[PDB]
Amino acid sequence: ELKKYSHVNKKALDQFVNFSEQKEKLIKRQEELDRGYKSIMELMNVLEL
Amino acid sequence: IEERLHTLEEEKEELAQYQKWDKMRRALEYTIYNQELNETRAKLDEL
Amino acid sequence: KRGPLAKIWLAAHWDKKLTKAHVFECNLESSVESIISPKVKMALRTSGHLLLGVVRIYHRKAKYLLADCNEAFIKIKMAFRPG
């Protein structure tokens, strides 16, 4: 059983938890960024008018 | 990054399995060396 | 100077003192962008200036996000296989 399971990458669990939370955070940033761009385009058209 | 998290999940299950078996090895090793210690006690008393 | 939109003033005129701590969480974009449209006695000049300001702000946030993502990807590539 040892010989079969030699090359395991330790520390994976903390990696998962922390990186999943941080990925969620940045995804939220991305969605906000998209909405902001949309708002900029609309307001710019209004100004043009 | 998404692909890498997926691969991480795979490695997580692998880690769980290795951890369990490693526990098995450590327990078994300690027990058999306990038996060695028992032989130690036994043969020392025999003399 | 004084006002709840002075940051956009600074970003539209000087823009250099604006730090990553300022840009980061001082301003909620979706409210000020709404604020621009109905304010009384808004000069068109000032409107264009404020446009440049808020767009530059958005650009800075985007850059920061890209930098953070690149850093994260460099982070996750570590591993420890003791052999």
Curated annotation (Swiss-Prot), chain B:
Cellular localization per UniProt: Nucleus; Chromosome; Chromosome, Centromere
Domain of life: Eukaryota
Post-translational modification: Ubiquitinated by the DCX(DCAF15) complex, leading to its degradation. Regulated by DSCC1, it is required for processive DNA synthesis, coupling sister chromatid cohesion establishment during S phase to DNA replication. Deacetylation by HDAC8, regulates release of the cohesin complex from chromatin.
Subunit structure comment from the entry: Forms a heterodimer with SMC1A or SMC1B in cohesin complexes. Cohesin complexes are composed of the SMC1 (SMC1A or SMC1B) and SMC3 heterodimer attached via their SMC hinge domain, RAD21 which link them, and one STAG protein (STAG1, STAG2 or STAG3), which interacts with RAD21. Also found in meiosis-specific cohesin complexes. Found in a complex with SMC1A, CDCA5 and RAD21, PDS5A/SCC-112 and PDS5B/APRIN. Interacts with NUMA1, and forms a ternary complex with KIF3B and KIFAP3, suggesting a function in tethering the chromosomes to the spindle pole and in chromosome movement.
Involvement in disease: Cornelia de Lange syndrome 3 with or without midline brain defects: A form of Cornelia de Lange syndrome, a clinically heterogeneous developmental disorder associated with malformations affecting multiple systems. Characterized by facial dysmorphisms, abnormal hands and feet, growth delay, cognitive retardation, hirsutism, gastroesophageal dysfunction and cardiac, ophthalmologic and genitourinary anomalies. Cornelia de Lange syndrome type 3 is a mild form with absence of major structural anomalies.
Annotated domain remarks: The flexible SMC hinge domain, which separates the large intramolecular coiled coil regions, allows the heterotypic interaction with the corresponding domain of SMC1A or SMC1B, forming a V-shaped heterodimer. The two heads of the heterodimer are then connected by different ends of the cleavable RAD21 protein, forming a ring structure.
Function of the protein: Central component of cohesin, a complex required for chromosome cohesion during the cell cycle. The cohesin complex may form a large proteinaceous ring within which sister chromatids can be trapped. At anaphase, the complex is cleaved and dissociates from chromatin, allowing sister chromatids to segregate. Cohesion is coupled to DNA replication and is involved in DNA repair. The cohesin complex also plays an important role in spindle pole assembly during mitosis and in chromosomes movement.
Note: Mutated Cornelia de Lange cell lines display genomic instability and sensitivity to ionizing radiation and interstrand cross-linking agents.
Family of the protein in this entry: Belongs to the SMC family. SMC3 subfamily.
Name assigned to this protein: Structural maintenance of chromosomes protein 3
Curated annotation (Swiss-Prot), chain C:
Domain of life the protein comes from: Eukaryota
Expression by tissue: Expressed in the gut (at protein level).
Positions of modified residues (Phosphoserine): S37
Cross-linked residues, Glycyl lysine isopeptide (Lys-Gly) (interchain with G-Cter in SUMO2): K39
Signal peptide positions on this chain: none
Post-translational modifications reported in the UniProt record: Cleaved by separase/ESPL1 at the onset of anaphase; this cleavage is required for sister chromatid separation and cytokinesis. Cleaved by caspase-3/CASP3 or caspase-7/CASP7 at the beginning of apoptosis. Phosphorylated; becomes hyperphosphorylated in M phase of cell cycle. The large dissociation of cohesin from chromosome arms during prophase may be partly due to its phosphorylation by PLK1.
Family: Belongs to the rad21 family.
Disorder noted: Cornelia de Lange syndrome 4 with or without midline brain defects: A form of Cornelia de Lange syndrome, a clinically heterogeneous developmental disorder associated with malformations affecting multiple systems. It is characterized by facial dysmorphisms, abnormal hands and feet, growth delay, cognitive retardation, hirsutism, gastroesophageal dysfunction and cardiac, ophthalmologic and genitourinary anomalies. Mungan syndrome: An autosomal recessive disease characterized by visceral neuromyopathy, intestinal dysmotility and chronic intestinal pseudoobstruction, megaduodenum, long-segment Barrett esophagus, and a variety of cardiac valve or septal defects such as membranous ventricular septal defect, pulmonary and tricuspid valve regurgitation.
Domain commentary: The C-terminal part associates with the ATPase head of SMC1A, while the N-terminal part binds to the ATPase head of SMC3.
Assembly and interaction partners: Component of the cohesin complex, which consists of an SMC1A/B and SMC3 heterodimer core and 2 non-Smc subunits RAD21 and STAG1/SA1, STAG2/SA2 or STAG3/SA3. Interacts (via C-terminus) with SMC1A and (via N-terminus) with SMC3; these interactions are direct. The cohesin complex interacts with NUMA1. The cohesin complex also interacts with CDCA5, PDS5A and PDS5B; this interaction might regulate the ability of the cohesin complex to mediate sister chromatid cohesion. The interaction with PDS5B is direct and is stimulated by STAG1/SA1.
Protein name, per record: Double-strand-break repair protein rad21 homolog
Source species of the chain: Homo sapiens
Gene name of the record: RAD21
Residues of the full protein shown: 10 to 92 of 631
